[PDB]
Structures are given as C-alpha cells and as structure tokens.
Coordinates of N, CA, C and O in Angstrom, one line a residue:
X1 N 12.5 22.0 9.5 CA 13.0 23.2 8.8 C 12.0 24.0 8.2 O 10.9 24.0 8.8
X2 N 11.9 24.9 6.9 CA 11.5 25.2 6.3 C 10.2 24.6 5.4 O 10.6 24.1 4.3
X3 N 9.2 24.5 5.5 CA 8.3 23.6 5.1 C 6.8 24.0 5.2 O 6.1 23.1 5.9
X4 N 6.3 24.9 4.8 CA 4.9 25.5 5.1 C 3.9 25.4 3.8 O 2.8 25.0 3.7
X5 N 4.7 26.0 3.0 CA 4.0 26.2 1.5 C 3.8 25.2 0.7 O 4.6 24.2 0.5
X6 N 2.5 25.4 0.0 CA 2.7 23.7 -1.2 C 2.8 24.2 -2.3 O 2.0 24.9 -2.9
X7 N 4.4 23.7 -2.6 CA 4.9 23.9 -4.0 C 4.6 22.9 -4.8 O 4.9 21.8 -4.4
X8 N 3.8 23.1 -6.0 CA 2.9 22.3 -6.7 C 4.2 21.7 -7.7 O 4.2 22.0 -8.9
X9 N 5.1 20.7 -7.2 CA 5.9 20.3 -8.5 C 5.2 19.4 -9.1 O 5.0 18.4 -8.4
X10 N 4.7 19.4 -10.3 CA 4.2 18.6 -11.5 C 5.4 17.5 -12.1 O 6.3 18.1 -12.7
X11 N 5.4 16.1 -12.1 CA 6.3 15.1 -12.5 C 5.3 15.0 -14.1 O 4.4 15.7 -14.4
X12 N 5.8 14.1 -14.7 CA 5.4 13.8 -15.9 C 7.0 13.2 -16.9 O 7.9 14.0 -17.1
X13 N 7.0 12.0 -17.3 CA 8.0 11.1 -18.0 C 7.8 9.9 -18.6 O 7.7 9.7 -19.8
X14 N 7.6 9.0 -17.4 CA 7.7 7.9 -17.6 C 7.6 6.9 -16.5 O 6.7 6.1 -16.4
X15 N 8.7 7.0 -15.7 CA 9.0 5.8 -14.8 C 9.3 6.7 -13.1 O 8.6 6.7 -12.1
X16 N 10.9 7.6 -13.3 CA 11.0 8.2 -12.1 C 9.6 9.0 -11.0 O 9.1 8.7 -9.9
X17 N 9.3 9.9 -12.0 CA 8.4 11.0 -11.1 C 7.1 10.5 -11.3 O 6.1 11.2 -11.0
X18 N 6.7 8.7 -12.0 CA 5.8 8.4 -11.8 C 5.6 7.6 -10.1 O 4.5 7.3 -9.6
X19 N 6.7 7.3 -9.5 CA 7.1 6.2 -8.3 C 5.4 6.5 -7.4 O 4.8 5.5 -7.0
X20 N 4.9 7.6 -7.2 CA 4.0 8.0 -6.5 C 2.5 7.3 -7.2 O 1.5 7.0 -6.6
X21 N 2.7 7.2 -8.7 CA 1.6 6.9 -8.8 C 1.6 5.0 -9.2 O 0.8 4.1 -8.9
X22 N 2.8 4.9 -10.0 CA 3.1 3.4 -9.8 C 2.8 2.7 -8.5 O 2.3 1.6 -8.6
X23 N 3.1 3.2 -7.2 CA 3.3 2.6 -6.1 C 2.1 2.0 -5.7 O 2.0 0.9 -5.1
X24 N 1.0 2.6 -6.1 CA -0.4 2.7 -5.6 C -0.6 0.8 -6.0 O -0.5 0.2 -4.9
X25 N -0.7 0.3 -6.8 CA -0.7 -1.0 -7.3 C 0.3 -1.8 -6.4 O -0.4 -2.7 -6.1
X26 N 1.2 -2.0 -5.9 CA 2.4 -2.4 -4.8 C 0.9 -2.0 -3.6 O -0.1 -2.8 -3.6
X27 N 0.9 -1.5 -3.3 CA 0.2 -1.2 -1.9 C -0.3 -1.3 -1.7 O -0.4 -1.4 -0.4
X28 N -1.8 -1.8 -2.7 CA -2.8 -2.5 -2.7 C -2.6 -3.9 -2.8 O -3.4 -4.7 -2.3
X29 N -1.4 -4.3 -3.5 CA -0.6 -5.6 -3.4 C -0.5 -6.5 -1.7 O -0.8 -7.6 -1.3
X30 N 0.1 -5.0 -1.1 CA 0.5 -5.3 0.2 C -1.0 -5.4 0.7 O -1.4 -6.4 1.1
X31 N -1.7 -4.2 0.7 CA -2.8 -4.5 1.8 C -3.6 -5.7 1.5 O -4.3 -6.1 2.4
X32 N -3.7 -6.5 0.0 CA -5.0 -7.6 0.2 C -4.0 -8.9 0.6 O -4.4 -10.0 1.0
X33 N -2.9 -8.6 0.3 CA -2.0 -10.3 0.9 C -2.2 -10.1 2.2 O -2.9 -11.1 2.6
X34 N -2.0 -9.1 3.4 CA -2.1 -9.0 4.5 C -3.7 -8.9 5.0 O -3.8 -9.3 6.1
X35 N -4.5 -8.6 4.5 CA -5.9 -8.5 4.3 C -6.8 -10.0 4.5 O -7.5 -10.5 5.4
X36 N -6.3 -10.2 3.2 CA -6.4 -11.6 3.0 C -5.4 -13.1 3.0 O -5.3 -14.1 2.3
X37 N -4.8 -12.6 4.4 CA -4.1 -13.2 5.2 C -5.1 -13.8 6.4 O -6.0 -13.2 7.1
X38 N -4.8 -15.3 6.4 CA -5.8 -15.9 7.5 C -5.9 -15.6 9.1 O -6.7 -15.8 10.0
X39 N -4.8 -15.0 9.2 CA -4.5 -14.2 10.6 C -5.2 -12.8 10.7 O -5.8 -12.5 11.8
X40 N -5.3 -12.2 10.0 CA -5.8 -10.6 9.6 C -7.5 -10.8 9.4 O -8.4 -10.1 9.9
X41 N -7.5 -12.3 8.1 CA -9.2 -12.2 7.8 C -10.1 -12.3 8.7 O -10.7 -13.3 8.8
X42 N -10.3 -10.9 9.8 CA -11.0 -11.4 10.8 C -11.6 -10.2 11.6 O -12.6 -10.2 12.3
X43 N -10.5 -9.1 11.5 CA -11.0 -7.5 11.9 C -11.3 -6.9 10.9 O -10.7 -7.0 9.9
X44 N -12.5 -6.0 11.2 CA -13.1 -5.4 10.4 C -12.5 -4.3 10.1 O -12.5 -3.8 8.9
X45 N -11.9 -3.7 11.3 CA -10.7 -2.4 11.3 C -9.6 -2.4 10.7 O -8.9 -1.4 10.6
X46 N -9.3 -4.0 10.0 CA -8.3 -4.4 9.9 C -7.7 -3.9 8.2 O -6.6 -3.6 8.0
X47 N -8.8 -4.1 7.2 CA -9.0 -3.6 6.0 C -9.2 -1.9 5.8 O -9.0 -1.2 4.8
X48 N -9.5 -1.7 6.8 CA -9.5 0.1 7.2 C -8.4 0.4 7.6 O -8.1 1.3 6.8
X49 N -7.1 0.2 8.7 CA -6.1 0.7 8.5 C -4.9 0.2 7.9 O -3.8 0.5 8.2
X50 N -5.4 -0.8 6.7 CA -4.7 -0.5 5.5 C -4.6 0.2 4.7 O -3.5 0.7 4.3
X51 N -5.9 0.3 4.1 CA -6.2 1.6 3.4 C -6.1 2.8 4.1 O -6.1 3.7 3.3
X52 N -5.9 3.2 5.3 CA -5.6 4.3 6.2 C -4.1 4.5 6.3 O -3.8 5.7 6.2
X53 N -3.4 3.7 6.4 CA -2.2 3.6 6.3 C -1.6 3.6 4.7 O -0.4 4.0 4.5
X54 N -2.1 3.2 3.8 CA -2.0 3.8 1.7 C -2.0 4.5 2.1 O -0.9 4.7 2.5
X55 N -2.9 5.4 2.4 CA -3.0 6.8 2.1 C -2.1 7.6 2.7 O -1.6 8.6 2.0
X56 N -1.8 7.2 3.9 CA -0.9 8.1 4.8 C 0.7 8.3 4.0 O 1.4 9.3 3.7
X57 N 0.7 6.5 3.7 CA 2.1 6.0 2.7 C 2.6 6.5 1.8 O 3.8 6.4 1.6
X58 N 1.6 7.1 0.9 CA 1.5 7.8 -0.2 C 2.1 9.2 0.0 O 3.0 9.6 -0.7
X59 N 1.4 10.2 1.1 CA 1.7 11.1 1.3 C 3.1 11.6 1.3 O 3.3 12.7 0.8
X60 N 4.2 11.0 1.9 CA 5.4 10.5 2.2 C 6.3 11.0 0.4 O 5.3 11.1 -0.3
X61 N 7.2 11.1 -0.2 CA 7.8 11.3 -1.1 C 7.8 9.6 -1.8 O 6.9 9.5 -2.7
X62 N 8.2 9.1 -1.6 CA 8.3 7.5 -1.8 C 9.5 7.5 -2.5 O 9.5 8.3 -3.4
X63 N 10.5 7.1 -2.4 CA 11.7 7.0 -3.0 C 11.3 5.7 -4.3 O 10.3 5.3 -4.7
X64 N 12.6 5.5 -4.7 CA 12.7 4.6 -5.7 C 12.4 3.2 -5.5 O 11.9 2.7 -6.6
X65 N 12.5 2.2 -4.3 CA 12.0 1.0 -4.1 C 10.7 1.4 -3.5 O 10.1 0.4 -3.1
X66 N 10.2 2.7 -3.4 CA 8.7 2.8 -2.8 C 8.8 2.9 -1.2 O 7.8 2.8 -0.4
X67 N 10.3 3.2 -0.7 CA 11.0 3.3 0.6 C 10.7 4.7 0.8 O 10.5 5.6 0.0
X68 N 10.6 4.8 2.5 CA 10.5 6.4 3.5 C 11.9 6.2 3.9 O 12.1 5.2 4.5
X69 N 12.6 6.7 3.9 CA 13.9 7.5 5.4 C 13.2 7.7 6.2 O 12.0 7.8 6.0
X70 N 13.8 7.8 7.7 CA 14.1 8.9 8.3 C 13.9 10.6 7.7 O 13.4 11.3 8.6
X71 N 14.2 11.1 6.9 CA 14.1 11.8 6.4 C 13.2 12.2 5.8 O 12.8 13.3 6.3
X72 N 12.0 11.8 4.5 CA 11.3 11.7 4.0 C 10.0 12.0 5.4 O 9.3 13.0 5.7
X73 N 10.2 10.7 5.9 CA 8.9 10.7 7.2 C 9.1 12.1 8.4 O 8.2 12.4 9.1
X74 N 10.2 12.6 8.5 CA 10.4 13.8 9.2 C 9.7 15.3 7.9 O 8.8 16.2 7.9
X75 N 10.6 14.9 6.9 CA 9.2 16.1 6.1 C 8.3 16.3 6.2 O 7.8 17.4 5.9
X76 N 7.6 15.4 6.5 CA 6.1 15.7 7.1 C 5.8 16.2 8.1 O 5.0 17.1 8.0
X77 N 6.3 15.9 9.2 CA 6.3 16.4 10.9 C 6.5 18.1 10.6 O 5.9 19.0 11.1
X78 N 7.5 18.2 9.7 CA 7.7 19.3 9.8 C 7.1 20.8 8.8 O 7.1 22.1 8.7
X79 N 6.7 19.6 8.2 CA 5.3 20.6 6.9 C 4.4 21.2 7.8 O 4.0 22.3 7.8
X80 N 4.1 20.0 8.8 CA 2.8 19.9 9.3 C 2.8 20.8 10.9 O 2.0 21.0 11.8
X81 N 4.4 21.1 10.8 CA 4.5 22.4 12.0 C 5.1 21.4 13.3 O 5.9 22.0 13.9
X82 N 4.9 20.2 13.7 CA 5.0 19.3 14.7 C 6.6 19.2 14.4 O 6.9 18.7 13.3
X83 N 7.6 19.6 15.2 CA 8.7 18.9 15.4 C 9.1 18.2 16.5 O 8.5 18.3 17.6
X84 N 10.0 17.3 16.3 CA 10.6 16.2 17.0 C 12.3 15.7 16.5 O 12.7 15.9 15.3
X85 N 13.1 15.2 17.3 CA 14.1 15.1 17.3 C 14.5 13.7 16.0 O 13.8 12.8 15.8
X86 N 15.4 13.8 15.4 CA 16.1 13.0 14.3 C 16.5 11.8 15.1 O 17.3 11.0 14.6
X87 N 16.2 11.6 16.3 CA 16.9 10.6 16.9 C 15.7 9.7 17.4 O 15.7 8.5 17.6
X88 N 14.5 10.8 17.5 CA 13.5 9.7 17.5 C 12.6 9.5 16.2 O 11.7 8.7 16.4
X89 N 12.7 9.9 15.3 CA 12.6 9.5 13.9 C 13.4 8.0 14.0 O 12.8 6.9 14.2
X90 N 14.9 8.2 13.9 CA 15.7 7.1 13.9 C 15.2 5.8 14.8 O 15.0 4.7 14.4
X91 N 15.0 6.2 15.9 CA 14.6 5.1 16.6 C 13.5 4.7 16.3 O 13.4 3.5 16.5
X92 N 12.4 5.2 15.7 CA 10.9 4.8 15.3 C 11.4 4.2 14.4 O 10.9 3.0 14.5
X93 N 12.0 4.2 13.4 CA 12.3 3.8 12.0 C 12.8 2.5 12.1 O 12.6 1.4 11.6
X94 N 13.8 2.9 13.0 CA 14.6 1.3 13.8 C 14.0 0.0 14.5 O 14.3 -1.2 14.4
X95 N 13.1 0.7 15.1 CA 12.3 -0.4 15.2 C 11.4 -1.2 13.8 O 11.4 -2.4 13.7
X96 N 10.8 -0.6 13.3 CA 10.0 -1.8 12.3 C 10.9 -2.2 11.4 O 10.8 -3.3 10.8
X97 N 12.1 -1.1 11.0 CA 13.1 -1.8 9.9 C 14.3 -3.0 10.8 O 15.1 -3.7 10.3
X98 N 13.9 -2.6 12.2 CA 15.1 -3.5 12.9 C 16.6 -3.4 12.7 O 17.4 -2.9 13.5
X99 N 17.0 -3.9 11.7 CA 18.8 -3.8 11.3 C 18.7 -2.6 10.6 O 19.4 -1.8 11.1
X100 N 18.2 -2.1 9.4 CA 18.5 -0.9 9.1 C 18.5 0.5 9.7 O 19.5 1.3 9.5
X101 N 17.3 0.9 10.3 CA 17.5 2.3 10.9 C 17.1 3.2 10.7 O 16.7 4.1 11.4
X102 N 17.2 3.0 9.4 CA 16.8 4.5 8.8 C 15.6 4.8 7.5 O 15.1 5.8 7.1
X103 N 15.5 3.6 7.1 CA 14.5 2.9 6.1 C 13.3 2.1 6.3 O 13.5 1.0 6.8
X104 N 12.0 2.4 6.0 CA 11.3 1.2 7.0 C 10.6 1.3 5.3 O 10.4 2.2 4.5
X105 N 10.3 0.1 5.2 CA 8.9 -0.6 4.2 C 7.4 -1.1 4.7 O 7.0 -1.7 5.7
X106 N 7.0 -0.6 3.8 CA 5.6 -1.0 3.7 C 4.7 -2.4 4.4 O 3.6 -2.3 5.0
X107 N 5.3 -3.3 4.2 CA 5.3 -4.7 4.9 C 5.3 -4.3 6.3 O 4.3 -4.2 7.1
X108 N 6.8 -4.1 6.4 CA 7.0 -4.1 7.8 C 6.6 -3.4 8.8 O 6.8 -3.8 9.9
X109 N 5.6 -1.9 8.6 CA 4.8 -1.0 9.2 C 3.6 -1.8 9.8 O 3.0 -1.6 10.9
X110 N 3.6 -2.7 8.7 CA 2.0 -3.3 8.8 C 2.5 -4.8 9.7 O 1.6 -5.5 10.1
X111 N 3.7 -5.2 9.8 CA 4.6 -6.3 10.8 C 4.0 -5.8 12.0 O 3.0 -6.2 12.6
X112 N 4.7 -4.9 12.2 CA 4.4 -3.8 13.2 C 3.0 -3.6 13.9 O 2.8 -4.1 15.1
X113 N 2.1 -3.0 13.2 CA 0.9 -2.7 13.3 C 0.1 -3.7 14.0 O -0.4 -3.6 15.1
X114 N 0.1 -4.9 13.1 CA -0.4 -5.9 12.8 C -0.4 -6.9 14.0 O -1.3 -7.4 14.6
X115 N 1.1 -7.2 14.2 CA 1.4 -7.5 15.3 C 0.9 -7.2 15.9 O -0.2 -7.7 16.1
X116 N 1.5 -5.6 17.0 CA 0.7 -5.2 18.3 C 0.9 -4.2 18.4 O 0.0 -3.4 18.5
X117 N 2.6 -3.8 18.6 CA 2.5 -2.4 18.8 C 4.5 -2.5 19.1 O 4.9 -3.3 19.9
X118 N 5.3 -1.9 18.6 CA 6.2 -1.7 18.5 C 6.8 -0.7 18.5 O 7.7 -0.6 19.4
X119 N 6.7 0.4 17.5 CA 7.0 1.2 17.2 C 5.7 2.3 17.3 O 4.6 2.1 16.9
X120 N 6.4 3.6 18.0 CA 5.1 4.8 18.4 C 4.6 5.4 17.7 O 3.7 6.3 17.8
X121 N 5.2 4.8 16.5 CA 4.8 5.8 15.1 C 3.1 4.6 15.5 O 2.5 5.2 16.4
X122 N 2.7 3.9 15.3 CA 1.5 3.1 15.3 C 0.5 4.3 15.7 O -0.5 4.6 15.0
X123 N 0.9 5.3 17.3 CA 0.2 5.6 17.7 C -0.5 7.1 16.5 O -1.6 7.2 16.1
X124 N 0.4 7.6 16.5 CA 0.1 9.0 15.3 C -0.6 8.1 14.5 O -1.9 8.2 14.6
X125 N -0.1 7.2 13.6 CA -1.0 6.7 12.5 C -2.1 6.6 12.9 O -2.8 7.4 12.3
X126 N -2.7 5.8 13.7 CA -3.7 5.3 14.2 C -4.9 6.2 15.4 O -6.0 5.9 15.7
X127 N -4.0 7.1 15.7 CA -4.7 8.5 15.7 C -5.3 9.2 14.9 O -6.1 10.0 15.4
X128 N -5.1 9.3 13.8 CA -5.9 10.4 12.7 C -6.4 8.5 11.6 O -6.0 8.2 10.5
X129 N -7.1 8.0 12.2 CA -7.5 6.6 11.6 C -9.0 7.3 10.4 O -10.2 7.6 10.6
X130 N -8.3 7.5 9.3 CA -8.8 8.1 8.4 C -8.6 7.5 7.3 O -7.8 7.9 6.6
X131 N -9.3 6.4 6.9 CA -9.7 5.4 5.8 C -10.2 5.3 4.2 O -10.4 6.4 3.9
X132 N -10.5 4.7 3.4 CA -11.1 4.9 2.1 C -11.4 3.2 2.0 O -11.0 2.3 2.7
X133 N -12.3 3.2 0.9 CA -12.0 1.4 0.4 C -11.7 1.7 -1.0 O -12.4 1.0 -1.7
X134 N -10.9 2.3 -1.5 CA -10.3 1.5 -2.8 C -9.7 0.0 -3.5 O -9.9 -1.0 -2.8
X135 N -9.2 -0.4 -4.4 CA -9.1 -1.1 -4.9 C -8.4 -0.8 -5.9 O -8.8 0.2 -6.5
X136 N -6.8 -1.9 -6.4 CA -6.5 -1.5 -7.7 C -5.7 -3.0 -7.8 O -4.8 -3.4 -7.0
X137 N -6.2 -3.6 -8.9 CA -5.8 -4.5 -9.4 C -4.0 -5.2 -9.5 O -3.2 -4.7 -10.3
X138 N -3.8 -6.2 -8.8 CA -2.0 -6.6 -8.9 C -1.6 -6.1 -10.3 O -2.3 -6.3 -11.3
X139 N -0.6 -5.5 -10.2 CA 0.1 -5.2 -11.0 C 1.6 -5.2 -10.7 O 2.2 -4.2 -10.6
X140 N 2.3 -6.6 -10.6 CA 3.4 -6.6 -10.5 C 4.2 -6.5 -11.2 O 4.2 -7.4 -12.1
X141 N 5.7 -5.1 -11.2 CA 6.2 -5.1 -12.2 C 7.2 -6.3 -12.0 O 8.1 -5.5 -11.7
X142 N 7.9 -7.7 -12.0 CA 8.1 -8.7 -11.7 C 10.1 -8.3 -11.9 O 11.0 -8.5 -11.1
X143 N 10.5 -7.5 -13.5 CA 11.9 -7.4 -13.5 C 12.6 -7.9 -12.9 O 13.1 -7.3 -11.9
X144 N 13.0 -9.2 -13.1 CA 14.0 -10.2 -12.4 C 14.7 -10.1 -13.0 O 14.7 -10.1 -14.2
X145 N 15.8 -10.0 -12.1 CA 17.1 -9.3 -13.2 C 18.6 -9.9 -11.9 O 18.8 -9.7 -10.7
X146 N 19.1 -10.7 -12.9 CA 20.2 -10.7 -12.0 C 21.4 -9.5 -11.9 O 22.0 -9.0 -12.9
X147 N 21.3 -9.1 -10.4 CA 22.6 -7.7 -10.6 C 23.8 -8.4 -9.7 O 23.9 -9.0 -8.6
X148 N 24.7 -7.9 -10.6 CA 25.9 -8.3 -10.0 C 26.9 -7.2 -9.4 O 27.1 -6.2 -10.1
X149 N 27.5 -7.4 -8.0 CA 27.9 -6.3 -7.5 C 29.3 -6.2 -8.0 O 30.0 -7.1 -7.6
X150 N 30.2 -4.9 -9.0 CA 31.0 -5.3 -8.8 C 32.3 -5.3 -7.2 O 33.4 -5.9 -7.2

C-alpha cells in the first residue's frame, strides 16, 4: 500500500512503545543459546547471521510477545517498494510457524535457517547478509504468572 515516507513516531512510557527496545535483550538471548548451541558452535557465519538476522528482526514493528504477522513483515516489502502477494507472505510465514500461519517467532526463523532451508524468506534474508557483533547481557523478564482462561 501506501508506505514511502518515514514518519518519525517517537514512543516514550514505559513498557508498550518500549517492545522495540526491550526486545533487543530476548534476541541476544536467542542468538547466544543458538550460538552457543553445540550444533551451531562451529560456523563462523553462523554468529553473523544472527546478528544479521537482530537486526533485520528489529526492523519489523515487533508486536507485544516480540511476534511479526504476516502483516507487520509485508510492511516492509512494501515501504521498501517490492510487492508480493499476502498469500505468499502467508505461506512463508506458514512454514517456520507451521500450525499457525500467520505469526512466526524468532526461534523458529533461526529453526529454519539453521536447519537448512525451508522457508524463501531465508533467501531475501540471507541476501542482503549484513551483520554487526553486538552483545547485550540476559535479561530475562521471567513474569510467571498463572493466567487463567475464562
């Protein structure tokens, strides 16, 4: 759709409109478990498109559990001028989330990845393989909470 200009919205609160910068600590979570996973400890590339893949992750809006849509990951395609169909969004999505569809997490990109090759989205990612080495210390917010559905 509509999507060319960068509208500079400024968050500032607390918790909601921080999700983008809280997340950063989760993702670094995710890349050194996978990282420093005995299957992984062993490519050099392997620590690079983690951090290549943060970054990309980040870009993305990040919803509330730190989740993309379908939606979310098409905003981009379409900022960025490239369109494609909602149905192959869905199907890309479908595959690394498998039963859901329309939601894929951070883990499971890197399931994906990691693995071998599943989902086509691997290939765009891994096309513009554009890296950093950061670091940010676990910070899990842990909130164990039993919720009960009514």
């Amino acid at each position: 759709g509509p999507l060319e200009s960068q509208t500079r919205d400024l968050q500032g609160g607390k918790a909601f409109g921080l999700l983008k910068a809280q997340q950063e600590e989760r993702l670094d979570e995710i890349n050194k478990q996978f990282l420093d996973d005995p299957k992984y400890s062993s490519d050099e590339d392997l620590p690079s498109k983690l951090e290549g893949f943060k970054e990309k992750y980040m870009e993305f809006d990040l919803n509330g559990n730190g989740d993309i849509d379908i939606m979310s990951l098409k905003r981009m395609l379409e900022k960025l001028g490239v369109p494609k169909t909602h149905l192959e969004l869905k199907k890309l999505i479908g595959e690394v989330s498998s039963g859901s569809g329309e939601t894929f997490s951070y883990p499971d990109f890197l399931r994906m990845m990691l693995g071998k090759r599943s989902a086509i989205l691997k290939m765009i990612l891994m096309y513009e393989e554009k890296a950093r080495e950061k670091e940010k210390p676990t910070g899990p917010p842990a909130k164990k909470a039993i919720s009960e559905l009514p």
